[PDB]
Design an enzyme around this catalytic site. Sequence first.
Site, PDB file in Angstrom:
ATOM      1  N   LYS A  71       4.287 -15.068  10.971  1.00 45.70           N
ATOM      2  CA  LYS A  71       3.756 -16.312  10.321  1.00 45.70           C
ATOM      3  C   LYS A  71       3.872 -16.319   8.730  1.00 45.70           C
ATOM      4  CE  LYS A  71       0.593 -18.784   8.869  1.00 45.70           C
ATOM      5  NZ  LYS A  71       0.623 -19.691   7.790  1.00 45.70           N
ATOM      6  N   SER A  79      -6.597 -13.593   1.471  1.00 46.51           N
ATOM      7  CA  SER A  79      -7.689 -13.119   0.797  1.00 46.51           C
ATOM      8  C   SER A  79      -8.656 -12.252   1.448  1.00 46.51           C
ATOM      9  CB  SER A  79      -8.344 -14.786   0.664  1.00 46.51           C
ATOM     10  OG  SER A  79      -8.769 -15.152   2.064  1.00 46.51           O
ATOM     11  N   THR A  80      -9.826 -11.687   0.946  1.00 43.24           N
ATOM     12  CA  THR A  80     -10.526 -10.953   1.707  1.00 43.24           C
ATOM     13  C   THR A  80     -11.417 -11.717   2.531  1.00 43.24           C
ATOM     14  OG1 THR A  80     -11.074  -9.248   0.003  1.00 43.24           O
ATOM     15  CG2 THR A  80     -12.744  -9.647   1.492  1.00 43.24           C
ATOM     16  N   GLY A 137      -9.276 -11.949   5.835  1.00 43.57           N
ATOM     17  CA  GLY A 137      -9.154 -10.776   6.311  1.00 43.57           C
ATOM     18  C   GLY A 137     -10.544 -10.486   7.406  1.00 43.57           C
ATOM     19  N   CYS A 183      -2.448  -9.468  -5.804  1.00 41.56           N
ATOM     20  CA  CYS A 183      -3.478  -8.884  -5.273  1.00 41.56           C
ATOM     21  C   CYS A 183      -4.206  -7.711  -6.266  1.00 41.56           C
ATOM     22  CB  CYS A 183      -2.953  -8.222  -4.113  1.00 41.56           C
ATOM     23  SG  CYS A 183      -1.623  -6.801  -4.309  1.00 41.56           S
ATOM     24  N   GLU A 214     -12.080 -12.543  -7.579  1.00 41.92           N
ATOM     25  CA  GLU A 214     -10.897 -12.506  -8.036  1.00 41.92           C
ATOM     26  C   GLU A 214     -10.436 -14.083  -8.081  1.00 41.92           C
ATOM     27  OE1 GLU A 214      -8.051 -12.302  -4.490  1.00 41.92           O
ATOM     28  OE2 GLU A 214      -7.118 -10.631  -5.374  1.00 41.92           O
TER      29      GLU A 214
END
Lengths: 494, 494, 494, 494
Positions: free
Chosen positions: B186, B240-241, B244, B296, B393
């Site tokens: 994807k 992104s965290t 995740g 990142c 971030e």
Amino acid sequence: AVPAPNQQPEVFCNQIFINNEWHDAVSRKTFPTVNPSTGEVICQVAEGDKEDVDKAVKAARAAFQLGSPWRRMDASHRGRLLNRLADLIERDRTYLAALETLDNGKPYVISYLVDLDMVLKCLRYYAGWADKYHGKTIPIDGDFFSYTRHEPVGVCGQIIPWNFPLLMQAWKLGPALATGNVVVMKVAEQTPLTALYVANLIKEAGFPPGVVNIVPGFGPTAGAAIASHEDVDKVAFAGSTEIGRVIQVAAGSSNLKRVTLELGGKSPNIIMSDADMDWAVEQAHFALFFNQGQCCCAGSRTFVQEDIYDEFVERSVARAKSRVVGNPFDSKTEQGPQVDETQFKKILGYINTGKQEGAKLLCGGGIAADRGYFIQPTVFGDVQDGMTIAKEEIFGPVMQILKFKTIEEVVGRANNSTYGLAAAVFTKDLDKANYLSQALQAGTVWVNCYDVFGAQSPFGGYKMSGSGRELGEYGLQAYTEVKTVTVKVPQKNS
Amino acid sequence: AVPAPNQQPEVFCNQIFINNEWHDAVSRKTFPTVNPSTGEVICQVAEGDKEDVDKAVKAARAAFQLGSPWRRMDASHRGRLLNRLADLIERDRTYLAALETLDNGKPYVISYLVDLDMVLKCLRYYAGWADKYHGKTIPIDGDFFSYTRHEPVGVCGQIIPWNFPLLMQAWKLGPALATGNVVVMKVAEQTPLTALYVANLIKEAGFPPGVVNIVPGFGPTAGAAIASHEDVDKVAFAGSTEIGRVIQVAAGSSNLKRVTLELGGKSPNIIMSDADMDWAVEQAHFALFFNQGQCCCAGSRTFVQEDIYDEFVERSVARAKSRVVGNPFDSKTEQGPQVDETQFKKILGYINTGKQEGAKLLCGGGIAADRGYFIQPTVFGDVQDGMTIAKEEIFGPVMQILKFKTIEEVVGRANNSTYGLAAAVFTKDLDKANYLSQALQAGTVWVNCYDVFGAQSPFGGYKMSGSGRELGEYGLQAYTEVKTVTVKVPQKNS
Amino acid sequence: AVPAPNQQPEVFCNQIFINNEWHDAVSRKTFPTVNPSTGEVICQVAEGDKEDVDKAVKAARAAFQLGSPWRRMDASHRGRLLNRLADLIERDRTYLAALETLDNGKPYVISYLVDLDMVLKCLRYYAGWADKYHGKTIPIDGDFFSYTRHEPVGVCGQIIPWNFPLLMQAWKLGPALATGNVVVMKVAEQTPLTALYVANLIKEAGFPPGVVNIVPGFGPTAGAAIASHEDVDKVAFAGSTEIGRVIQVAAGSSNLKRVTLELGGKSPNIIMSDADMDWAVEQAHFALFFNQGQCCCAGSRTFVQEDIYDEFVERSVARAKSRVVGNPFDSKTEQGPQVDETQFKKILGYINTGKQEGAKLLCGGGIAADRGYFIQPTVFGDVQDGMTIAKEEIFGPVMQILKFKTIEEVVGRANNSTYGLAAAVFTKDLDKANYLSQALQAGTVWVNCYDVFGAQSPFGGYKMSGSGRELGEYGLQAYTEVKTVTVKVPQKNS
Amino acid sequence: AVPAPNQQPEVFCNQIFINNEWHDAVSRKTFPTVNPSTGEVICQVAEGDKEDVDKAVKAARAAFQLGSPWRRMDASHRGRLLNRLADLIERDRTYLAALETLDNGKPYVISYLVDLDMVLKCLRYYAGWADKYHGKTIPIDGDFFSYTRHEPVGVCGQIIPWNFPLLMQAWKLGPALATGNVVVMKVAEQTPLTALYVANLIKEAGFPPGVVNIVPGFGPTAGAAIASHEDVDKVAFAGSTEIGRVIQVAAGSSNLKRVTLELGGKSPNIIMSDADMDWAVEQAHFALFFNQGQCCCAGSRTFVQEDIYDEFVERSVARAKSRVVGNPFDSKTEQGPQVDETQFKKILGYINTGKQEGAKLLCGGGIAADRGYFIQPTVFGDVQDGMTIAKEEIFGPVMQILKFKTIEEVVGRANNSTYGLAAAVFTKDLDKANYLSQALQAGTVWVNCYDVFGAQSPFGGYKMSGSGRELGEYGLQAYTEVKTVTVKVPQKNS
Ligand code: NA
Ligand code: NA
Ligand code: NA
Ligand code: NA
């Protein structure tokens, strides 16, 4: 804390050890082993020769037969046997430390805290390898299953020197036994006694008969017999670069047995101007003087950057003069006698050459006692690369200090040697450390330290300092024979 | 040399790729992709959703069946195919770099010399692994032969971000295909185009149909459909965290697939007082600003020792002010636009946040251009640990400079983060470098450098920056399923 | 040679173990543990909950701080400590084997000769790994030195089942401690006692406080608390698939901790027509009935080729009827009780289902004693793939025999399962063994054997049977966090 | 598909290759190379001697200097150069295959489809190793960071035989170049031409001058000069066991250079009564007759179980009688001539000895053509272990068939050889296969196949068949020098 020594330990084992039993030599000959502190005979020891080597090799080959207790034994069990051996050595640690000192001359405190500690750590480290040195499954082309077996090389001849008698026995037995080999070991005539007591402990630990065989005797007889034997698969030798040559020729002239060698060095210890001075002086002293200077990798060319040269030399002289030489059973003694009369004379000879060729004698230079093979800690300054004492391995308490200017210059001078066992760099600078450790042509480069041995990290020579590596995972490679098995399968899939 | 770009490259691939053929979405839906330098629509792209993912997963599963072309193919031949793909990407390098810049915004010189170069290096490196990731033969207790096969994990869902579209595609395909897996990928809605072009090159290289399938579309639809799919064996997600967290839940709520995650960071760049000033200033600039700050592992907390703080800040501000923002096809441009409007607004939000919370705005802080999504290089000084701009971030050209006194202090401050992706240390001192590199809780520690990726060295996060490793030998671990085969034998021997 | 058991051993440890001290639960609540041979309460055990788990996690985190005794300890010494623990367990082997039997129900002779033997071998195996799991030095592009450190993952939550209480504890502690991690362990409420005694030996062995912490209690409470804890870095769970989901979802919902799972199976044991009949009958009996059928990998689908089906069934039934069920302290007892009342009733339920769904009851089928949880060894013939007893893990002394005709048929039927923990193949034919071991989708394939675990070989599931591997070198991967350090150098050379 | 050969290919390279330039011998002497199919001279070739070896060694030494283009080159780029070399060899495949056939005698179809294929696969395999042979980071005791560098051994002397001229060149260059060594290669006087054309391709590919140097000439001159050279670090030799001894003696007598050897065999091919007959007959024929019998590992003792002996022999004789001996450029030809007159005579002498000593001559036995070195495929039956043809390596189309009764008997007879290069077992039985593959004292054991080489799997001798391994990851070990760097650190933590 160091337990009090028996300064005159009884000797229990002084014969040839074959099939877990004690044998006189076929000839009935014996040779004296001498206490280097006094020059007096400790005891007689069986004088093994070719016929005794032959008995040992046949015992070893029989123990190695497919279906034997040693071949069938689980790998994990070889590990248990090694761990049991270490426990017995630990039980007998004060005895072995005292016997080591008596026969070799090194201080008892050092025998106890250093040699015996390192023996235990080596045996225990290799015990853990016994069941972990895996072969491979391999994704070969076509309809096949291919894999490797890591098998034992076989009957292993091991010839070990006198400088670290117990530790060298352990460095050899650890990897060989972890990998399922059998051993015919020749110990040094100067220091046969501690290895033979260990053979008694090998029996006690439960190793099958014939797995370890020990033949005391002389090099041109017993060692030569091993090197030339038609049924010895592998030989490992540690000693002089001179005898090293004899081994490789004998292997080539007999059965093409596999060979590894650990030979001399003239290792450079490089002190950059930004080094911590106190630390560098102390470590450079240790680097040279450790074990009566009888260390394969002794830092025997101490290169010192010109800006700090004068102070370094002054501190180094002060430290050498303070070094206590005396009875190695006395707690205060830092330096024992040299190992034997031959070495004693050789070292005095090298000291004479250093004086003759115009190196600046700064302290020492002579005998340190009227009895025993004691030599004063000796420092030569203003040493030049072409001097004999800058080129040849002295193997005694004789320090060479050389002055240099640039990092580029010192690399060339350090590498301008047929030896390459070890080297060191003392510096606070990240880039200098990395530049030097890459550029130096040596098997081990120490940074801000010296003689840091770990059972985990390999050790061995570049150039004429030998070949192969001992210790760590690498130490198993010379003791392994690789077999590929490639099997036709109906249809290979990922 | 950089070949002159085509500033309006033609688009050839804008559909769903399954079984080496191009398809519309079942729904016939398309979505526009935007050129972030102009804010204009480039073209429309097929909008894949659950039904399209289902088709992709079935095709991948079919390609993975025992006896299939991809399963039977020699491991070495998988390597030949990866090498062939690399050659095709190299053939089409100038076109791909231009398309990458058009859809993503990064400077063309950088797409050409950095991204494409790294793509080629990544694929070529993993081509080399295809036939070298051995299983083991194992010396188990008893009368057995025991060994492991390293098999492919199976159907791998791979969800990749927009920051490095081509490179992230390569980081994912390299190890998965080296180890004989199949892929449903994807790609990011912001940057679908280059990955789709690479799909044409996959067919051209000779990969069997269904080995790589690519489904462009949105996250909560197509990405979620991969994560939750009952017949996907493994998911790899970078982004992104926040997202995740979704993936691991979706995985555990489905079939318990294996999951690896590459998430955000707030990586500390520590400048010791003994650092090379000019190098540290330039590297700290690169560490933060590289790729419009969309990295990142961006060096987004620049810790500077107090004695050099003022000079460092002066130099850093001058460098930020000098940084050329503009048309990414102009060779003078160092910084392109941010990738899209959403990111543009988020960064403006963070800039205002820093102002609101009392960080000292030293330069930039505003919009850099009328058209597109351009933000001025922005530097905040006197940043404090509790500030939002010091914790979260930002993913844009916004630099945080913090002052510290001691090495002990800065370890604690650097590690006080729920992120742990990377860190760096600038110092000339050996002990400081080793102290910090050990102490920092980060997946990569750079010493006197930043953003030094090698296909050979692994990369990934501690803490909430991710789990598992990409690149190197380590990058193969997540793509292998291990099978032990243990066989009774008549009599085991060493 | 099995020492006489204490048939009613005393219990010495029944509390929560944190920082090498024994604690009541914060709530002061206790829960009973039962002797399954009699249904009577042995003793009360502290009932740990979230608050207790919090105390344990904080203790572990403290023990894991940089510069702590456990962090500074030489890797080799971690090895020494594991070895010491093994020695203490061996000292207390007779006691621990009897306690294991008391709390779990398995025969004493088996606890003594099998469980304890495997516990010792597992700990001794991983002791050897402590100082051998090397990072890498890596020939990265450019003027850099790049390497990896293998660091511990950190605070490890470990939740272990009741089937092999002592062995499962060892499977967990061995790799975690060998790699320098710290542990918070939740033991099964059915079998807490032996693990708690072992905690006493962990203290005795000299492990620093906080390195191992054990919280007995209930699953929905203490287990969940570990899995959801924000400061637990890694979780390993063995048990049912249901909680497997719970665990991975918690971990995704909490702090992204790393997860490994060993879950159910319904493992196929395939008897080809060319098998050694007597060996295959005996081993198929063992494969199913071992440990009261309470084995994660029980051979609970016995596929038998049609030509030998009738004879194999006849012999298997005779063998099941001869199996002695009784007091597990009686030397003649082959099968003890099931672990608890819940399992006891659940198994009886499955037997009823088997009977009603048209499987042929050949022997057994009911309770085997009036007191304690004893079930008759039960054999069902003519079992079909769609039957409940052919799909669901019974975890009891209930054998399923299924007929098949061809090798392709059996592969597909064996693989048509959401489970894939293990499989076995009995055949004399080389090509059949190779075809099947390749084709079977299972973590372990046994050939002419069953339930052959070595510490040396990895074990774990495909598909819904789990993820990750335990034992062998592979067992260390889940316990290692990899750090890359990449250092600028003046000039890289090969 | 096999492209039509040019049956009289032009020779472009016939001189000494040093620093990517072509040189006459210092002496200006040349030697003829002969076409074995006709006995006529192809061309003259520079006769390299000691002085030419000296020039080559100096060139290689300069190329290996720290800071040189070859030393500084990225490891990955060495990989690219190896892949580029393979592309060039592929481009010139039809030419090289024809030239190989002209100079060596092997059928062109085999040169093209086998030799050239293997060369490409070998080079491409090792290309992938270039940047993947990691050193280690090691958890040594104490406050230290310890690691190893895998450095190149240095100047590698490589002496290769005439049986597989191009393939042996590839087997040597692949690992040596992958690991960053430099090479001085001596090629066989019978077959210098193809290796020299490849040297032109090495230049074309972009290898720096001096990295590969090739010296054609005789053994006692050029080969000896390499083995005895004081600045060659490593020698690899393939050829007769006879010359192997000379090499190892030369190494020991000179500078203690590292040595690996690939020498003779008398490999046993064991056919069990349960073997697939048609397959075993065809494979035993291949095993012996491949490459005109000129294979290190030829199945030159065919042991056949008494129950199938008569049939096996009848079928074997039929296949030998129908093997087509003729012009190697004719697509129908299965067997070309022997490589030279010396071999031609030696083989005829062995045939005579075979008849004299009482072996039953079943077919062939004489010269096959009036010109060139063609010999009839020859089969001897009822061979006994004590016969010369059963003991000595013939190196021609002469098959020995021996009868045996038991598996225990055949292991002993198979292993009763000073050779141990390879062996094979033909059986359908799993246990007989594992029994035999374990028991056979050979570097490669093939099961139901023969002469299955793959770049991935190692190959090399036990006993007097040589030492060291080629191919696989193992092939890198002899080309690597290991350096330990051990660095004092402020405080070591896990
Ligand atoms: Na002595
Ligand atoms: Na876009
Ligand atoms: Na219980
Ligand atoms: Na020729």
